[PDB]
Amino acid sequence: MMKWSNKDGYPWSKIIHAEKFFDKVIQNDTRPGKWEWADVVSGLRDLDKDPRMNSERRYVAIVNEDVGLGETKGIGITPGLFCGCQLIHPGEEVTSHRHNSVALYFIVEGTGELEVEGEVYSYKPFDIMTCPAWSYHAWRATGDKDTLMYVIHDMALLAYMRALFWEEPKGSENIRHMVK
Amino acid sequence: MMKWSNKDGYPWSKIIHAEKFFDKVIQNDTRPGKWEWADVVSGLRDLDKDPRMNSERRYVAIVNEDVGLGETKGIGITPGLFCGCQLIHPGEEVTSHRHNSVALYFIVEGTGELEVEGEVYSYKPFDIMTCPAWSYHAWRATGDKDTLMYVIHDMALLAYMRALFWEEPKGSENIRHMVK
Amino acid sequence: MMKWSNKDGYPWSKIIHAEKFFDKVIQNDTRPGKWEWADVVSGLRDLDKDPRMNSERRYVAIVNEDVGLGETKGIGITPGLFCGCQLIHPGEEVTSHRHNSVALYFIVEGTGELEVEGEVYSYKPFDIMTCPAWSYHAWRATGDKDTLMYVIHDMALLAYMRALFWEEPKGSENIRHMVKGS
Amino acid sequence: MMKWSNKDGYPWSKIIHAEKFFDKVIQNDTRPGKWEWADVVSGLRDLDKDPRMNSERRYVAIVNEDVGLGETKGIGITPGLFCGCQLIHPGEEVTSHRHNSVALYFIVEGTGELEVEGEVYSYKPFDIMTCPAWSYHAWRATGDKDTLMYVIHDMALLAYMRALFWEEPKGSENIRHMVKGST
Ligand SMILES: [Fe+3]
Ligand SMILES: [Fe+3]
Ligand SMILES: [Fe+3]
Ligand SMILES: [Fe+3]
Numbered sequence: 001m002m003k004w005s006n007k008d009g010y011p012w013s014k015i016i017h018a019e020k021f022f023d024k025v026i027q028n029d030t031r032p033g034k035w036e037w038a039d040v041v042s043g044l045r046d047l048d049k050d051p052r053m054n055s056e057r058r059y060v061a062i063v064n065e066d067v068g069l070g071e072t073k074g075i076g077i078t079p080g081l082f083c084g085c086q087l088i089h090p091g092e093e094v095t096s097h098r099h100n101s102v103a104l105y106f107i108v109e110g111t112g113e114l115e116v117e118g119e120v121y122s123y124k125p126f127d128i129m130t131c132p133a134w135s136y137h138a139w140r141a142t143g144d145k146d147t148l149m150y151v152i153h154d155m156a157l158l159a160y161m162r163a164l165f166w167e168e169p170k171g172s173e174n175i176r177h178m179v180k
Numbered sequence: 181m182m183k184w185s186n187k188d189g190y191p192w193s194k195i196i197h198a199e200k201f202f203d204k205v206i207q208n209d210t211r212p213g214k215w216e217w218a219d220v221v222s223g224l225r226d227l228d229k230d231p232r233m234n235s236e237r238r239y240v241a242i243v244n245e246d247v248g249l250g251e252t253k254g255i256g257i258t259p260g261l262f263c264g265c266q267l268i269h270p271g272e273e274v275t276s277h278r279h280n281s282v283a284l285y286f287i288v289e290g291t292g293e294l295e296v297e298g299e300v301y302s303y304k305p306f307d308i309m310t311c312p313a314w315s316y317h318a319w320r321a322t323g324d325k326d327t328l329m330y331v332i333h334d335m336a337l338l339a340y341m342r343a344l345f346w347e348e349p350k351g352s353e354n355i356r357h358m359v360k
Numbered sequence: 361m362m363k364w365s366n367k368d369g370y371p372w373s374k375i376i377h378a379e380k381f382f383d384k385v386i387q388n389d390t391r392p393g394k395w396e397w398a399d400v401v402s403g404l405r406d407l408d409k410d411p412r413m414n415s416e417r418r419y420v421a422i423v424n425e426d427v428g429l430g431e432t433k434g435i436g437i438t439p440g441l442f443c444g445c446q447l448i449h450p451g452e453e454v455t456s457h458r459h460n461s462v463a464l465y466f467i468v469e470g471t472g473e474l475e476v477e478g479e480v481y482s483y484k485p486f487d488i489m490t491c492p493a494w495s496y497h498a499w500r501a502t503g504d505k506d507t508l509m510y511v512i513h514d515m516a517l518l519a520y521m522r523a524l525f526w527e528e529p530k531g532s533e534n535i536r537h538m539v540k541g542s
Numbered sequence: 543m544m545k546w547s548n549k550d551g552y553p554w555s556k557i558i559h560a561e562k563f564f565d566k567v568i569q570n571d572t573r574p575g576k577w578e579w580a581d582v583v584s585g586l587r588d589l590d591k592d593p594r595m596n597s598e599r600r601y602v603a604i605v606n607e608d609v610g611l612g613e614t615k616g617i618g619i620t621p622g623l624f625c626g627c628q629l630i631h632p633g634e635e636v637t638s639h640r641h642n643s644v645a646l647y648f649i650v651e652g653t654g655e656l657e658v659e660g661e662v663y664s665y666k667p668f669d670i671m672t673c674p675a676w677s678y679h680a681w682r683a684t685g686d687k688d689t690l691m692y693v694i695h696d697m698a699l700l701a702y703m704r705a706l707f708w709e710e711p712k713g714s715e716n717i718r719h720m721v722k723g724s725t
Binding site: 181182183184185186278280281282297298299301312313314315316334338341342343345352355357 | 363364366460477492494496523
């Protein structure tokens with residue numbers, strides 16, 4: 001965890017006036033978000049211009065900036081929901097990993113196989129599949145079209161509570177409590 | 181909600197790199213918090229030095245500034261928990277209200293009556309009581325010693341989702357969606 | 361809220377053994393879920409065989425039964441996510457309503473108009489759109505192909521907390537605190 | 543994690559009618575809870591009738607049974623908050639552990655030391671202290687009176703999401719994903 005000192009007391013543990021609490025707690029409203037697939041597809045195909053790019057790092061996140069706290073730019077698609085899209089070229093692999101964040105996958109394009117906890121399934125467009133919290137899961141695109149997926153995850157909720165664990169690549173030595 | 185416009189597009193609706201998302205979603209760890217009762221009671225007595233202050237506003241938030249997100253000083257006592265303390269003098273009342281946020285009460289000191297949806301209970305030190313989401317509740321402090329309450333609630337969670345409602349004072353025409 | 365008595369005290373307010381909390385707090389793990397679009401679409405068609413069906417009631421919930429608490433059937437697609445699909449025939453409307461639950465809409469097929477808080481967008485397939493909590497929103501399907509939507513929402517989370525509100529149809533008198541008996 | 547088979551398809555993956563869904567998500571309302579400290583203390587003191595009782599297991603949970611899904615006996619104090627109380631005799635210890643659930647401690651009675659990630663703090667009645675998610679923490683009661691603490695936590699939130707981790711005793715080999723099965 002951390003090397004810290006309480007020998008100067010606890011300056012961070014404070015007591016504030018209800019007006020400051022209330023002023024910080026109430027949020028602006030968020031305008032509706034709209035995103036177009038062409039732009040998502042443009043974004044992701046742009047990722048291939050980077051030499052340092054591979055299949056495991058080829059996600060964009062779909063965000064509504066109004067959703068942020070205070071005046072800050074948010075990263076949720078709504079306040080409590082998070083969403084990303086991913087491109088996998090045929091023949092690419094996303095190797096086994098796990099995280100206690102769950103993921104919800106919707107196949108927009110492409111075919112392939114998904115492996116979770118030793119079992120393979122062969123996917124096709126508009127399949128829906130989940131990778132349960134802390135389940136080992138891996139991808140391989142097949143066929144002649146890129147796999148593009150629309151993904152809902154709660155990684156961010158757990159990050160904010162500081163309860164996110166990730167293990168990539170596979171192997172106990174790779175487990176991390178996900179904090180800066 | 182809002183008068184708004186899409187006539188110029190949805191500039192707030194965006195698509196971002198996985199590295200930006202990751203960087204904004206991982207949080208700093210949080211040093212343990214410690215608060216002293218004396219400081220809480222002192223904070224509360226201070227408020228009385230406001231002439232324009234009454235029983236319904238006599239609350240302080242207990243915060244651990246580390247639990248903030250990104251650069252924000254936090255207002256939770258932990259990331260996902262929120263705590264307040266409140267002081268009612270004998271013969272004061274917090275009149276009927278409701279909010280969709282729940283509240284959990286620990287009576288540290290004092291006695292009196294809690295009314296929730298038409299039923300009255302007489303509390304004493306170290307009683308524990310809940311005011312269910314959206315239930316009409318009211319307080320009347322009795323005896324000679326001030327009522328001091330230690331309060332756990334989820335008001336901030338609903339506030340962040342923009343899903344929080346507040347009816348004060350009693351009367352459906354007083355309901356507000358709590359944003360702005 | 362409710363008429364209730366405490367005259368008999370608080371029998372439901374208990375104190376339980378650590379063993380009992382733990383036996384009840386720890387869940388079974390959950391097998392991964394897999395749904396095929398064809399099962400969804402078939403499901404949505406069946407609903408038209410009902411004469412007492414219209415645009416507004418025409419949704420199915422995609423569920424993972426393993427996700428239940430204790431030994432019960434779950435209602436989530438994951439423990440904390442909720443997923444629905446809806447079908448609107450062209451020329452149908454979903455009338456203006458609001459709820460403090462949020463909705464994330466993916467257009468799989470169809471075209472039409474989304475109205476949110478007085479602003480209209482014309483959607484096409486694979487567009488993504490949100491209806492923020494408690495915003496007035498309305499649907500009208502256009503063109504020739506049915507609109508089919510993949511929808512994620514937090515309604516169940518708010519319901520479990522008993523902090524969910526729903527106003528349908530539009531009008532403050534239609535507001536309900538969504539608990540068994542409204 | 544899981545020895546499972548998809549060789550017989552995925553029968554748990556269902557599609558249900560809105561009517562069945564709505565019928566299942568909407569819950570009964572919850573009566574207010576009230577609990578009295580005398581009864582809590584009596585509970586905790588009772589537990590010491592068990593001879594194989596120690597400081598690590600001297601907790602009871604404070605529950606509002608109306609809070610459960612369906613007509614089920616729930617275990618939250620509210621739907622989304624969970625509350626326990628614990629008794630530590632002076633000279634007893636809760637040894638180092640960590641869990642990704644947070645804990646919020648209110649000292650009702652007693653005195654002692656709280657250690658979190660190498661730092662000690664000496665506690666007294668009506669002190670408020672947190673043990674952040676995944677921080678090593680340990681207790682030792684001092685003085686001539688039992689430590690009684692009023693504790694709020696989100697262990698159950700995490701348990702339900704199947705995202706709860708627990709390491710007791712200290713040491714990585716003892717980390718568990720907390721699901722029925724894995725310790
Ligand atoms: Fe993954
Ligand atoms: Fe209140
Ligand atoms: Fe709606
Ligand atoms: Fe602990």
